[PDB]
């Protein structure tokens, strides 16, 4: 589902990586770690996540190797890049060096928490999605049609997504200047 992180209706708070680390005591209880860590596999896919993050290729995106349903180790690339570069970019909330940490925090612990929410936030299979995209076009197609040179809005969308016609009204191109010129 384009790696999905979910169907959009819940994937929102992923980017709020500060929010979870801010409290972190209520979210862990919400996700119910004691019952989830039991049945699902954790170590193997988390190990392979680093191997996929290896900059050279021949390693798939971890999501293809290990589906995100049972292996509590797979997340898209950008999600893991985000959690890593957040841990290194904003290290203020997370403590650190390591001994002082192990009272109330742990970088690996909180990263495993975010891993866990990603697992907890997949598309629940069986969701009729096509009709979801149908609503996602219909609603804004209603929203704004009075403008505030190419035509913008529903006449435009009518060509790209409905008629897909050759010889559109104004097919233009944009070319970047180069230093030699």
């Amino acid at each position: 589902y384009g790696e999905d992180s979910l169907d959009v209706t819940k994937q929102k708070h992923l980017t709020q990586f500060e929010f979870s680390a801010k409290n972190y005591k209520s979210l862990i209880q919400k996700y119910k770690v004691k019952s989830v860590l039991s049945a699902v596999d954790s170590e193997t896919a988390s190990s392979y996540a680093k191997k996929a993050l290896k900059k050279p290729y021949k390693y798939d995106p971890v999501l293809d190797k290990y589906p995100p349903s049972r292996y509590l180790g797979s997340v898209s690339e950008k999600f893991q890049r985000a959690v890593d570069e957040y841990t290194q970019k904003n290290p203020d909330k997370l403590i650190a060096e390591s001994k002082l940490d192990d009272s109330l925090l742990n970088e690996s612990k909180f990263k495993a928490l975010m891993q866990l929410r990603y697992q907890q936030s997949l598309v629940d299979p069986g969701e009729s999605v096509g009709v979801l995209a149908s609503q996602s076009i219909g609603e804004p197609s209603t929203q704004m049609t009075l403008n505030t040179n190419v035509t913008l809005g529903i006449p435009r969308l009518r060509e790209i997504i409905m008629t897909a016609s050759a010889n559109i009204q104004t097919p233009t191109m944009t070319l970047r200047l180069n230093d030699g010129v």
Binding site: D7, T9, Q11, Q135, S136, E139
Partner: protein, 602 residues
């Protein structure tokens, strides 16, 4: 629905296809030959378009064939014969291009047989779903040479199927490509690739009348006519080239021409009484026309056999033939012969497939203009007393809610929280409206008891005993009853609210919060209230679609609900640091905000 009825079948598919000449007579239950509809005694004419055997004409008349009343008679077809048979109107154009592809003297294809057999191998290998393997078989470059090429295609397909053995989407993508290439090949050719003759060309009309001039003198050196001639020539075309046409379609009996069309039962074609006028209908009338033209064909054919005398004979006979072709075209395609035809009542897009199948009027579903209420909840929805007392739903009766259903039937169908009318397990429904409180008490006393007057009363299938009496009761404070407003653009437009029942007023009540979802201004616009009857439906509704569980509109992530105008600016006035409250106001305000008991939990 009923909860008892078990029906076991699980339909896995439907299969479309033509209908041949034997089965139309197998399903025949009578023949319609007399045009007259009704006699002086006004009774259903025997054998007429309203014959009693076709379908039970109302005023309590039992059907002849099945001999049981109208409430259960399912109607039976009838046949109306024609020795003309006119070619089926819907396939007229494809039949036309096929006729163009015909070579009358040759009775093979205008295309080279080797090319049509290439076409045959294409479909043969497509049947098992092998795409590149189909484009492979053309990899040959070379009548005798032509027969060798055909045998090369045969051996290619032979090894391909041998390796393969040891619908789905992409199948149709190729099987339509072959159809388009088939036409591109067939209609381009004029002279016979097999016979070397120039079979005469053919000219048609949009009125579905076809023929052209005979051959020219030069090509001989090298209009309108009967349908039996066309039928026989197409029979030769098919049976001589059974393979590629069988792949295209082995059966070729009545594909293009209909030897007996069926009159559907009277149940489907009623004589609606609007005021006083009694018009039979459009379809009865047009079937009458084709029947009269059929008997006219019979008489005129007899006149022909009994014998410019031959000229007048053939002219008048062809006139009768073309008239019957024209009127059967009218029946099946009212787009021709300028009342609705069948094709137009289907394809009209005002009628079926859009106005009776996808979306249909529904029972147990009321409707009102809607005022706002902030006091109830964000879950709950107001329900006026009229909707409560009138919207009914079944409730099985068990050991532990017998008390509630007892009280319900004690109250009756005229005073909330009463129930409406009691269903017995056999399948009947006995009302409580015409009864008295004494009678209702009596009937409610024997509400939990096996009353079926045997172990197996209906017949020797004894599960009817197990199911409990279903009491039809009114909605109450916990039931989940859907809401919607058209246009329903995006999914939070329909939701499920818990009912709360109010006294007096005549319009439902909702909370401000949900409003921005349904996109209403509450100026006096109105919303459909529904009530799913069974328990599976209301269960899945209450859980998946409970208002709060639709808190994120799914185009983006941002929240679509929320508090609104007064609440928000008074929020800016309460959160502001300039406001101070004493004990009295603080206690009072906190309590008004919580409202524990009705919500509960604390």
């Amino acid at each position: 629905m009923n909860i008892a009825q078990p029906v076991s079948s699980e339909i896995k598919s439907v299969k479309f296809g033509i209908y041949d000449v034997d089965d139309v007579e197998k399903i025949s239950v009578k023949q319609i030959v007399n045009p007259v509809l009704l006699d002086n005694l006004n009774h259903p004419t025997n054998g007429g378009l309203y014959d009693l055997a076709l379908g039970p004409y109302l005023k309590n008349s039992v059907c002849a064939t099945c001999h049981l009343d109208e409430r259960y008679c399912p109607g039976h077809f009838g046949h109306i014969v024609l020795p003309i048979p006119a070619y089926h109107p819907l396939f007229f154009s494809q039949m036309y291009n096929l006729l163009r592809s015909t070579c009358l003297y040759c009775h093979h294809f205008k295309l080279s047989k080797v090319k049509v057999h290439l076409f045959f191998c294409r479909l043969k290998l497509l049947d098992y779903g092998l795409l590149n393997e189909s484009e492979m078989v053309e990899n040959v470059s070379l009548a005798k040479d032509a027969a060798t090429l055909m045998r090369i295609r045969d051996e290619f397909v032979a090894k391909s199927i041998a390796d393969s053995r040891q619908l789905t989407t992409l199948l149709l993508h190729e099987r339509k490509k072959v159809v388009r290439a088939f036409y591109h090949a067939i209609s381009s050719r004029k002279q016979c690739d097999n016979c070397q003759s120039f079979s005469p060309n053919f000219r048609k009309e949009g009125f579905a009348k076809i023929f052209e001039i005979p051959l020219s003198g030069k090509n001989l050196q090298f209009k309108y006519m009967t349908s039996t001639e066309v039928r026989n020539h197409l029979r030769r075309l098919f049976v001589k080239e059974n393979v590629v046409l069988s792949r295209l379609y082995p059966a070729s009996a009545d594909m293009f021409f209909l030897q007996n069309i069926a009159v559907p039962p009277t149940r489907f074609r009623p004589a609606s009484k609007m005021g006083d006028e009694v018009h039979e209908n459009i379809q009865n009338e047009l079937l009458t026309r084709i029947l009269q033209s059929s008997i006219q064909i019979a008489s005129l054919s007899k006149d022909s056999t009994v014998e410019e005398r031959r000229s007048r004979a053939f002219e008048l006979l062809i006139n009768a033939f073309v008239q019957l072709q024209h009127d059967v075209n009218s029946l099946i395609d009212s787009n021709r012969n300028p009342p609705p035809g069948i094709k137009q009542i289907l394809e009209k897009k005002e009628g079926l497939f859009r106005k009776h199948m996808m979306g249909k009027r529904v029972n147990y579903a009321a409707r009102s203009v809607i005022s706002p209420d902030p006091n109830i909840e964000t879950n709950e929805i107001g329900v006026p007393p009229v909707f409560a007392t009138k919207l009914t739903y079944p409730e099985p009766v068990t050991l532990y809610n017998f008390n509630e259903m007892r009280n319900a039937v004690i109250n009756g169908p005229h005073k909330w929280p009463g129930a409406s009318h009691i269903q017995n397990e056999d399948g009947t429904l006995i009302s409580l409206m015409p009864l008295t409180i004494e009678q209702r008490t009596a009937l409610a006393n024997q509400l939990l008891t096996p009353q079926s007057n045997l172990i197996s009363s209906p017949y020797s299938y004894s599960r009817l005993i197990n199911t409990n009496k279903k009491v039809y009761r009114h909605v109450r404070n916990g039931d989940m009853l859907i809401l919607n407003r058209q246009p329903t653009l995006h999914k939070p437009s329909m939701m499920a609210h818990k009912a709360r029942i109010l006294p007096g007023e005549k319009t439902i009540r909702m909370h401000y919060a949900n409003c921005n979802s349904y996109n209403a201004d509450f100026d006096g616009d109105e919303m459909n209230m529904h009530f799913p009857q069974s328990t599976n439906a209301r269960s899945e509704a209450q859980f998946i679609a409970n208002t709060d569980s639709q808190y994120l509109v799914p185009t983006s992530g941002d929240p679509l609900r929320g508090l609104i105008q007064d609440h928000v600016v008074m929020g800016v006035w309460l959160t502001c640091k300039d406001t101070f409250y004493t004990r009295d106001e603080y206690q009072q305000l906190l309590f008004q905000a919580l409202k524990p008991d009705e919500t509960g939990m604390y």
